[PDB]
Amino acid sequence: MRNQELARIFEEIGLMSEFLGDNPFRVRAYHQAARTLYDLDTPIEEIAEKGKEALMELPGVGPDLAEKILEFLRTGKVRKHEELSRKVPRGVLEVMEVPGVGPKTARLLYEGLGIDSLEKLKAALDRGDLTRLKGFGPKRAERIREGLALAQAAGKRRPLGAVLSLARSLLEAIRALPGVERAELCGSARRYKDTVGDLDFLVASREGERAVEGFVRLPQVKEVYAKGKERATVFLKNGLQVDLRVVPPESYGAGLQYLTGSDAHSIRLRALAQEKGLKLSEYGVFRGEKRIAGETEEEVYAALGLPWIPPPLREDQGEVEAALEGRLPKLLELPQVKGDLQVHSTYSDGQNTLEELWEAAKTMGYRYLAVTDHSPAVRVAGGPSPEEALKRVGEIRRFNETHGPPYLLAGAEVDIHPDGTLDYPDWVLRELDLVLVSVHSRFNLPKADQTKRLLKALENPFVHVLAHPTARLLGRRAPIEADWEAVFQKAKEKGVAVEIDGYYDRMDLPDDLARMAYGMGLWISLSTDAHQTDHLRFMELAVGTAQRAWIGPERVLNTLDYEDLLSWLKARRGV
Numbered sequence: 001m002r003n004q005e006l007a008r009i010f011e012e013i014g015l016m017s018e019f020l021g022d023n024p025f026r027v028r029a030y031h032q033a034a035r036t037l038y039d040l041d042t043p044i045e046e047i048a049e050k051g052k053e054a055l056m057e058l059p060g061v062g063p064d065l066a067e068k069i070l071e072f073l074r075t076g077k078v079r080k081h082e083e084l085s086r087k088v089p090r091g092v093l094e095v096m097e098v099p100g101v102g103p104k105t106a107r108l109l110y111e112g113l114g115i116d117s118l119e120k121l122k123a124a125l126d127r128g129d130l131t132r133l134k135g136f137g138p139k140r141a142e143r144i145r146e147g148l149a150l151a152q153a154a155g156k157r158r159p160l161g162a163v164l165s166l167a168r169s170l171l172e173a174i175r176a177l178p179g180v181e182r183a184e185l186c187g188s189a190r191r192y193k194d195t196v197g198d199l200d201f202l203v204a205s206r207e208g209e210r211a212v213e214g215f216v217r218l219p220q221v222k223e224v225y226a227k228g229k230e231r232a233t234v235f236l237k238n239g240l241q242v243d244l245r246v247v248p249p250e251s252y253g254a255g256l257q258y259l260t261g262s263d264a265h266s267i268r269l270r271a272l273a274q275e276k277g278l279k280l281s282e283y284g285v286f287r288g289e290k291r292i293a294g295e296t297e298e299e300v301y302a303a304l305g306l307p308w309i310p311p312p313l314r315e316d317q318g319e320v321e322a323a324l325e326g327r328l329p330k331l332l333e334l335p336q337v338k339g340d341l342q343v344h345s346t347y348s349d350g351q352n353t354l355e356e357l358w359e360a361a362k363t364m365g366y367r368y369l370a371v372t373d374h375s376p377a378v379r380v381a382g383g384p385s386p387e388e389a390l391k392r393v394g395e396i397r398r399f400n401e402t403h404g405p406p407y408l409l410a411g412a413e414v415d416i417h418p419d420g421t422l423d424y425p426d427w428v429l430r431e432l433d434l435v436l437v438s439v440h441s442r443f444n445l446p447k448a449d450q451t452k453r454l455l456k457a458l459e460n461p462f463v464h465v466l467a468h469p470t471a472r473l474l475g476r477r478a479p480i481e482a483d484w485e486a487v488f489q490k491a492k493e494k495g496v497a498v499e500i501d502g503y504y505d506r507m508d509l510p511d512d513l514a515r516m517a518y519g520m521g522l523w524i525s526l527s528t529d530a531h532q533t534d535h536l537r538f539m540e541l542a543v544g545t546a547q548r549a550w551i552g553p554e555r556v557l558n559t560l561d562y563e564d565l566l567s568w569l570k571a572r573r574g575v
């Protein structure tokens with residue numbers, strides 16, 4: 001559907017027209033045309049095929065607008081939009097939009113200040129300039145800076161784990177709206193993508209316009225960017241940018257598929273539908289005018305002749321073909337994970353004592369937790385020395401002797417020196433239950449040298465896991481350059497697992513490299529890199545990554561019970 005695209009063009013013409021000071025009657029007309037297109041559920045093209053008169057049946061559309069609709073559908077553009085685009089630069093428009101701004105304001109801003117982009121705005125805000133620009137006073141000094149921040153974030157992505165819990169708190173409030181029967185967080189978040197744009201929620205309601213109204217008036221909502229009969233876009237007080245879509249209860253499952261995507265997955269499904277004489281839309285699966293499915297997502301998949309496909313797979317990367325052949329991959333699920341294989345303590349950089357870690361693991365129903373404190377080079381600090389590290393192993397053994405399950409594995413996160421040697425001697429490594437190795441320095445070695453360093457680390461027969469292998473930090477540090485094929489192949493041959501560290505700004509291995517490692521036949525270790533007990537919740541992110549990577553419970557260390565894990569760790573491994 002081109003409905004939203006056309007709504008935007010008309011809206012922009014409205015803004016640009018008012019900026020230029022066109023007839024306020026026309027300005028309002030374009031905005032009313034935009035609302036109509038925003039709210040219109042049936043494809044505009046279907047009404048345009050019926051003629052100019054039929055277009056004119058739509059609220060707000062007269063002869064002038066009906067012709068612009070046809071022009072857009074036939075050419076892909078609207079000359080009037082292109083014309084005002086010649087008079088109106090990009091950032092000047094951007095200034096007028098920045099939530100809380102607008103055209104006439106932006107015109108004094110343009111004429112008065114010389115603003116046809118954004119940096120200038122910022123400049124004026126911080127200096128107090130707008131406090132002296134005619135028509136730019138008090139409570140609005142706040143609003144404009146705030147709007148600017150919202151605009152600048154809308155291009156950008158955040159780590160899934162930075163926003164998932166906040167999204168779920170909004171989900172609780174949405175579910176609690178009177179009139180909402182079901183709701184779910186959809187979009188890329190439901191697919192466990194490691195960074196997300198806006199957050200998208202689907203609601204089932206028999207009274208959609210009233211559900212939108214309750215939604216936009218939630219205590220959590222700061223600013224409404226767009227709203228209509230069945231949809232809205234808002235900004236929360238906490239900054240989250242949120243889209244809502246409402247469908248009737250009979251359509252909920254079709255709405256879940258629609259809003260979860262990916263777009264590429266949905267394109268595949270719509271074609272499968274039409275190939276068997278059906279139409280898949282946000283509102284259901286239809287044979288002619290008859291709705292044959294829609295209420296649950298599994299029903300929708302079934303009507304297309306498919307098993308239900310887990311959201312993390314919905315990327316058009318082989319899952320449609322696997323579903324068609326009745327051979328979806330077996331995927332790791334969160335209840336199968338029996339413990340977390342990288343947690344830190346007060347012995348190094350963690351906030352928690354052994355007792356606190358144990359208590360948290362016990363609450364979570366884990367069988368074990370690996371306490372993997374840093375070797376001395378990781379933290380750029382004197383200890384824990386090799387002697388101290390072994391003293392700690394004894395302390396953890398005594399803790400297990402006095403506590404029982406969940407058992408603590410006495411581990412270490414051992415720094416890899418620039419030359420590939422390890423930051424504890426073998427007499428320490430041999431006594432640890434779990435040896436992780438990782439890069440914490442010299443991140444920018446040439447690719448071939450970084451590869452040699454990692455290969456040398458993998459020569460050590462006491463290593464169990466290559467921890468957070470790329471060392472990336474989302475928003476702060478790029479992945480290290482290394483030949484991952486060479487590294488993973490050596491790890492496989494030596495019996496070393498690779499880690500999926502679900503700590504929210506690490507997400508390392510990333511899904512794509514995890515898919516490569518598992519496809520090459522490696523073992524996988526999941527962890528949260530916890531430095532406080534609140535971090536243990538990130539195991540869901542590591543499992544979501546595993547699902548995106550087509551990883552099953554086979555060859556995942558965390559699915560082994562305690563005894564089988566210890567056996568694996570002690571065993572002759574590799575080729």
Ligand SMILES: Nc1nc2c(ncn2[C@H]2C[C@H](O)[C@@H](COP(=O)(O)OP(=O)(O)OP(=O)(O)O)O2)c(=O)[nH]1
Pocket residue numbers: 186187188189193195196197198199200258259260261262263266
């Ligand atoms: N990408 C895309 N998705 C669409 C379109 N029409 C409907 N959808 C569905 C599939 C998307 O997964 C879902 C949410 O759209 P978004 O643009 O928010 O994308 P998504 O949440 O998948 O990714 P994001 O992390 O926001 O970039 O809406 C379209 O034109 N493009």
Ligand SMILES: [Ca+2]
Pocket residue numbers: 055056057058059060061062
């Ligand atoms: Ca009309």
Ligand SMILES: [Ca+2]
Pocket residue numbers: 175176177178179180181
């Ligand atoms: Ca409710």
Ligand SMILES: [Ca+2]
Pocket residue numbers: 187188197198199200
């Ligand atoms: Ca989204």
Ligand SMILES: [Ca+2]
Pocket residue numbers: 187198199200243
């Ligand atoms: Ca969206």
Ligand SMILES: [Cl-]
Pocket residue numbers: 252253256295296297298
């Ligand atoms: Cl469902």
Ligand SMILES: [Zn+2]
Pocket residue numbers: 413438467468
């Ligand atoms: Zn580390």
